[PDB]
Amino acid sequence: GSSGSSGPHSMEPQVTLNVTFKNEIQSFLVSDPENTTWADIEAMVKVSFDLNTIQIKYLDEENEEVSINSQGEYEEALKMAVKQGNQLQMQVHEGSGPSSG
């Protein structure tokens, strides 16, 4: 690789994205939470559960569901995850779409 910026934070970058869709629970490791993009995540979670539109929501440091609709939003969330233990509790929330479902 390359020894540039680098932002492991702690216990490595690999973050545990715990997605909770309704009653379903999943986990997606992100060895590159800083490199990857929310767009990549969104889709992932979507395709992961085969969805056209979703509104993921992760619990912040207030136990309040926070929806990510941008990179910056994800970044922070990723920063917080590190606080927890390299994991983040996300909850999928189907937005709206006929096709599929």
From Swiss-Prot:
It is found in: Cytoplasm; Cytoplasmic vesicle, Autophagosome; Lysosome; Cytoplasm, Myofibril, Sarcomere, M line. Residues 14-95 form the PB1 domain. Induction: Upon viral infection. Changing K22A: No effect on interaction with SQSTM1. (Microbial infection) Cleaved by S.pyogenes SpeB protease; leading to its degradation. Degradation by SpeB prevents autophagy, promoting to S.pyogenes intracellular replication. Signal peptide: none annotated. Disulfide bonds: none annotated. It comes from the Eukaryota. The PB1 domain mediates interaction with SQSTM1. Homooligomer and heterooligomer. Interacts with TRIM55. Interacts with titin/TTN. Interacts with RNF29, USP8, MAP1LC3A, MAP1LC3B, MAP1LC3C, GABARAP, GABARAPL1 and GABARAPL2. Binds to ubiquitin and ubiquitinated proteins. Interacts with SQSTM1. Interacts with TAX1BP1. Interacts with IRF3; this interaction mediates autophagic degradation of IRF3. Interacts with IL12A and IL12B. (Microbial infection) Interacts with Influenza A virus protein PB1; this interaction promotes NBR1-mediated selective autophagic degradation of MAVS. Ubiquitin-binding autophagy adapter that participates in different processes including host defense or intracellular homeostasis. Possesses a double function during the selective autophagy by acting as a shuttle bringing ubiquitinated proteins to autophagosomes and also by participating in the formation of protein aggregates. Plays a role in the regulation of the innate immune response by modulating type I interferon production and targeting ubiquitinated IRF3 for autophagic degradation. This is Next to BRCA1 gene 1 protein. The gene is NBR1. The chain holds residues 1 to 85 of 966 of the full protein.
